[PDB]
Every structure is written in structure tokens, then in C-alpha cells.
PDB file of C-alpha atoms in Angstrom:
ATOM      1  CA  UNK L   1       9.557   0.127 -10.212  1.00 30.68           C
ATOM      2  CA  UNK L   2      10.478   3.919  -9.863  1.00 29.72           C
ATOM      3  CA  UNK L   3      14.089   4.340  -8.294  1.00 31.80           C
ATOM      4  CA  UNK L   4      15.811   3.320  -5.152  1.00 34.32           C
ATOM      5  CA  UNK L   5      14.153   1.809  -2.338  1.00 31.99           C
ATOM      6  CA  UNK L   6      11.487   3.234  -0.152  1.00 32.80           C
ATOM      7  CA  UNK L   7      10.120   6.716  -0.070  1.00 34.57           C
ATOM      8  CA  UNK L   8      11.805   9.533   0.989  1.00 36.29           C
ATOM      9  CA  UNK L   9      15.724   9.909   2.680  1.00 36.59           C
ATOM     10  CA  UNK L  10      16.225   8.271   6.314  1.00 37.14           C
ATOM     11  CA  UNK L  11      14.130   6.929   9.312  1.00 34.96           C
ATOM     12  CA  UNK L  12      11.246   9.263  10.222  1.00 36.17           C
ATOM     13  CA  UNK L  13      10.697  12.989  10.195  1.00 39.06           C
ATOM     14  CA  UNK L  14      13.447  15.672  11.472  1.00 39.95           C
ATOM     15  CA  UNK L  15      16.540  14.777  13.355  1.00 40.63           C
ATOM     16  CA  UNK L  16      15.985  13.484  16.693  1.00 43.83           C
TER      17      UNK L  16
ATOM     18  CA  UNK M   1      13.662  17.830  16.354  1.00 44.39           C
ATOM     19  CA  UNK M   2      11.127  15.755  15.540  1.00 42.84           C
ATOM     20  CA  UNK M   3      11.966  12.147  15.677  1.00 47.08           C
ATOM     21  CA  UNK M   4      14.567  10.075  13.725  1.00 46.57           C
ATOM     22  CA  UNK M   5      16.448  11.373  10.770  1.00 46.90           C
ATOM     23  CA  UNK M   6      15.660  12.476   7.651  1.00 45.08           C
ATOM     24  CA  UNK M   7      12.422  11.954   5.906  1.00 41.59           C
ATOM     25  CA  UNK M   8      10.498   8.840   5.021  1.00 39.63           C
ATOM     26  CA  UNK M   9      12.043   5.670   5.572  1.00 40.16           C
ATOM     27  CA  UNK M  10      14.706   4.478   2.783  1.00 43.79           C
ATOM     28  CA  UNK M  11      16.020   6.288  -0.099  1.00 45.84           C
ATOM     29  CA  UNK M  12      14.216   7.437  -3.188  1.00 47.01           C
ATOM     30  CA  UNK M  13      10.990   6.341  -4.265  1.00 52.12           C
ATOM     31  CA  UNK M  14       9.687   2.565  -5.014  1.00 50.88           C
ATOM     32  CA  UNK M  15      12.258  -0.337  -5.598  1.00 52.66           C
ATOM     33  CA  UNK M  16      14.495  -0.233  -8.473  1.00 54.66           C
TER      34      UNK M  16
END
């Protein structure tokens, strides 16, 4: 279903 | 920033 797997790009929200 | 990397978790949106 839909594309890829997950939702989004990455592990959380920002960079660090 | 923030905390992690990116935004979500994974890559794209569902599974497949």
C-alpha cells in the first residue's frame, strides 16, 4: 500500500 | 536541533 516504508524520511524530528 | 534525524520514522509513506 502507498510507497516505501513508513512515513516520512529518518528517525524523529530535526537533527539532533 | 530537535531530536534524531530527519522526519518521521522510515522512508516514504505506507509499505510498498
Amino acid at each position: 500500500v502507498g510507497a516505501x516504508a513508513x512515513v516520512x524520511w529518518x528517525w524523529x524530528w530535526x537533527w539532533x
